[PDB]
């Protein structure tokens, strides 16, 4: 390994270690004047010389190849001097080394004044590479090594990489250790295709033990103006935030592509707070605001990418003792795509609860809500909502079964206002006062079987658990209630057993279904499951008619076994894996979704992966909005195929890759390729990308973007001793996930 390979350059203190004051420690002399290999043993400090003369104010004069060995310092030099009163020593021209950590140097006139650890040179130079390798040096005139915190100081500095200087500005400090010091950082570069160049120049700050600041200018050569990029961080009695702000004075390409505007500016505002004060109160903020609805296509950020549709703006406040709750939230949104902008928003919500759990053999629970919708264009309806939900359980149990009989009683009372335009235009008319009361009923069940596999595997056990369900929600006409927060849900195997078809509380479908399904499982000898298969159907006794059935299937059947599902999970060994999934629908006459995966993970650096996805065009025709079925960009569905890899070469290199095909119309959706060196003094990093971006309207031809990153770092006077692989495997538009 590189760490163990480089570790054999730093000498270590093998002699016994003594903790405490060294002033009262005994003195040993081996040889007033002593001639010939004089040895001194004073605590951890050891001195060697051909000639040592002691003159007592105790002064010791050592001459001739004088050595030194302290707890964290080794010296060398012909002429020496010593004193016991202040623990100060003087050593002439020679070489010095750092023991216990890397660090090397040479000087003309040294000094080891006992006060703290301040050493002084006169023509010195402090590098960080192992002996025998000349790559870089920090050459100055006077250097003072302070060791109370982890700080170094340099005067008249002249950074040299080889026998050539590349720097000036005398007072600069190299922070050696693992303590934060307020200073500059290292720049980067790029050659992206939207702007012909790129350049950064960070700046750090450490206001308090829990505070930060990361001011960072930025160059955008194509445009021509520096875009300032501030930052912030904190940590307090409630969580930790990540405030941000990215100002930019003006542009030129934006003034040319989009003329006749007042001014061209840019900004941003990020804020992510999440904490739990004391033990009851809860807090949450997820603000994100942008200036123009094209920001993410342009200069990129680490808080949002090209694949995006809106920008969330949410608050929260919470109380939760043990059987109670409350919340005053606020959700608003902002849509980027400038095609149709009529998004809704939620004004202060409310969510009460209650959890009394011992009444007789039954249970108890209550819900509640009070919301006030408002739309963003002066003429779409705005309304109010109140909700209630008393429920009751009756759980049974046994060693091999269960029953979960349930009940409920829903209620709601809208009050709609500002109904002029919608009432005048369309046919169905909305009213100003509606109500809705509908009961429910649900019965559950379960079983478990077992066996001892006599077959190939001796000692393996197999289980087989069936299941069942029921449902009954009466039918009430809901054509007088605008659809505010209702969407059609998916149905995997886990979602098969559910009492809701539409999310939210605006539209509730009728039901007379009878679900089923079985599940098997093969255990190991020491109760380690390594196999799950699953099937399940649904038998509609009567279709679900919510009152507004504006869905366009191919064959319109109502009753019969309609939905199906599936699942699998294999765990071949500790360094493998396999997953899957599949849906179906007799109303579409085609598979609606399908997944797959496979993995191999020997360590954090070697891994391979494959995957598959699917979505039939009839799904996108019967679920997504109406303009998703006639445009040439969305009508064909998703049929992509991917692959990931990574494998170290020799002991310092690392190679990464990616790919994502699209078999429906042969194209390419991603490509990444980044090598990475790791020496004992520096590192190197490269990158690439071929992401998709935009859709040209003229001849229906997509637009691609290239990119070439670059990085460098000073390594050796720190603790980071790992190759950068995970930090580079999460940079493409479709990041990598762990499926083991």
């Amino acid at each position: 390994d590189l760490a163990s390979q480089c570790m054999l350059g730093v000498p270590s203190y093998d002699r016994p270690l003594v903790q405490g004051d060294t002033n009262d420690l005994p003195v040993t002399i081996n040889a007033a004047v002593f001639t010939g290999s004089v040895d001194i043993m004073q605590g951890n400090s050891r001195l060697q010389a051909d000639e040592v003369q002691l003159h007592q104010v105790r002064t010791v004069d050592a001459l001739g190849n004088v050595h030194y060995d302290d707890n964290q310092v080794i010296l060398k030099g012909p002429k020496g001097w010593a004193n016991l009163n202040t623990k100060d020593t003087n050593v002439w021209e020679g070489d010095y080394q750092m023991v216990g950590r890397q660090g090397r140097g040479k000087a003309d006139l040294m000094k080891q004044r006992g006060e703290n650890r301040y050493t002084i040179l006169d023509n010195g130079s402090f590098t960080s590479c192992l002996p025998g390798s000349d790559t870089w040096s920090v050459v100055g005139s006077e250097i003072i090594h302070d060791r109370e915190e982890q700080v170094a100081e340099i005067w008249n500095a002249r950074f040299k990489v080889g026998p050539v200087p590349i720097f000036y500005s005398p007072y600069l400090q190299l922070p050696v250790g693992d303590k934060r010091r307020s200073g500059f950082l290292i720049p980067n570069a790029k050659y992206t295709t939207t702007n012909y160049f790129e350049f950064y120049l960070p700046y750090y700050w450490n206001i308090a033990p829990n505070m930060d600041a990361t001011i960072t200018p930025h160059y955008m050569h194509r445009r021509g103006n520096i875009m300032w990029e501030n930052e912030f961080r904190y940590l307090s009695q409630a969580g930790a935030g990540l405030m941000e702000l990215d100002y930019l004075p003006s542009d030129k390409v934006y003034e040319d592509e989009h003329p006749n505007d007042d001014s061209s500016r840019r900004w941003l505002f990020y804020w992510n707070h999440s904490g739990v004060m004391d033990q009851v109160w809860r807090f949450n903020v997820d603000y994100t605001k942008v200036s123009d609805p094209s920001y993410f296509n342009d200069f990129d950020n680490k808080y949002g990418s090209s694949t995006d549709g809106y920008a969330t703006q949410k608050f929260s406040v919470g109380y939760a003792v043990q059987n109670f709750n409350a919340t005053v939230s606020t959700k608003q949104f902002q849509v980027f795509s400038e095609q149709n902008t009529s998004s809704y928003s939620a004004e202060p919500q409310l969510d009460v609860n209650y959890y009394q759990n011992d009444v007789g053999p039954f249970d108890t629970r209550i819900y509640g809500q009070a919301v006030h919708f408002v739309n963003t264009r002066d003429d779409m309806p705005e309304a109010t909502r109140v909700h209630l939900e008393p429920t009751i359980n009756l759980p049974l149990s046994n060693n091999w079964g269960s029953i979960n009989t349930e009940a409920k009683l829903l209620a709601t009372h809208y009050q709609q206002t500002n109904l002029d335009w919608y009432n005048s235009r369309n046919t169905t008319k909305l009213d100003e006062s509606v109500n809705r009361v509908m009961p429910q009923f649900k019965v559950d069940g379960k079983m478990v079987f077992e066996r001892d596999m006599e077959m190939l595997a001796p000692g393996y056990t197999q289980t087989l658990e069936p299941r069942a369900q029921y449902l009954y929600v009466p039918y009430r006409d809901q054509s007088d209630i605008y659809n505010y927060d209702s969407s059609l849900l998916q149905s995997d195997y886990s979602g098969l057993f559910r009492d809701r078809t539409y999310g939210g509380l605006d539209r509730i479908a009728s039901a007379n279904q009878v679900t089923t399904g079985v599940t098997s499982r093969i255990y190991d000898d020491a109760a380690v499951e390594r196999f799950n298969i699953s099937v399940g159907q649904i038998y509609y006794f009567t279709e679900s008619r919510t009152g507004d059935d504006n869905i366009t299937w191919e064959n319109d059947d109502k009753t019969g076994s309609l939905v199906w599902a599936g699942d699998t999970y294999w765990r071949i060994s500790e360094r493998w894996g396999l997953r899957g999934g599949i849906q179906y629908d007799t109303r579409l006459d085609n598979v609606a979704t399908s997944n797959s995966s496979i993995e191999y993970r020997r360590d954090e650096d070697r891994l391979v992966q494959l995957n598959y996805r699917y979505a039939s065009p009839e799904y996108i025709q019967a679920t997504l909005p109406k303009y998703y079925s006639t445009a040439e960009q969305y009508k064909n569905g998703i049929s992509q195929v991917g692959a990931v890899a990574s494998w170290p070469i020799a002991d310092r290199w690392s190679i990464v890759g990616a790919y994502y095909y699209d078999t429906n119309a042969n194209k390419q959706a991603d490509s990444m390729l980044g090598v990475q060196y790791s020496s004992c003094c520096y590192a190197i990093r490269v990158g690439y990308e071929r992401k998709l971006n935009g859709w040209d309207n003229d001849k229906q031809h997509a637009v691609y973007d290239n990119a070439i990153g670059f990085n460098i770092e000073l390594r050796g006077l720190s603790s980071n001793y790992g190759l950068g692989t995970q930090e580079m495997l999460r940079s493409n538009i479709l990041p990598y996930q762990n499926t083991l």
């Binding site: 060693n399 077992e450 849900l489 995997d492 109760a527 998703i638």
Partner: protein
């Protein structure tokens, strides 16, 4: 040739369990508590003057959401969400024992009805807890087997 289950889902030694966590009122500490109460184990909280009972200390919960598919113009199609839970059983006398859990879910995206697509994520992250709190219970019989050896 099959026979019904004759043992218990939770082994016959840990039928008096002590729960401990950092947020005794969060969603996970409700899901696990209810799931345990379903199986019959009585939970004496507020660690007291008894030393005969195995404990259970919960850990770090993380949720990650990212893109998984793209249309033919760059936009997003499907999101994918992952949860990771960690817990350590603390059988008295002997050493600790670590367990884990992991769930996978996905859903489509719709930029025209964003608000309705924010009340579908909440149901998903509410019902994923009921599986991340069932894998942990299903891993319990493995601990007893590693304790009898």
């Amino acid at each position: 040739g099959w026979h019904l289950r004759d043992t218990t889902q939770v082994p016959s030694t840990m039928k008096v369990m002590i729960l401990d966590s950092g947020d005794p009122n969060g969603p996970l500490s409700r899901a696990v508590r209810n799931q345990l109460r379903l199986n019959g184990v009585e939970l004496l909280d507020k660690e007291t003057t008894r030393k005969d009972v195995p404990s259970l200390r919960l850990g770090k919960v993380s949720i990650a959401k990212d893109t998984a598919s793209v249309f033919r113009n760059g936009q997003t199609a499907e999101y994918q969400m992952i949860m990771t839970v960690n817990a350590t059983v603390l059988i008295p006398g002997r050493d600790i024992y670590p367990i884990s859990a992991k769930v996978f879910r996905s859903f489509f995206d719709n930029p025209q009805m964003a608000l309705a697509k924010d009340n579908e994520q909440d149901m998903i992250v509410k019902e994923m807890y009921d599986r991340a709190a069932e894998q942990l219970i299903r891993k319990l019989p493995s601990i007893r087997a590693a304790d009898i050896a």
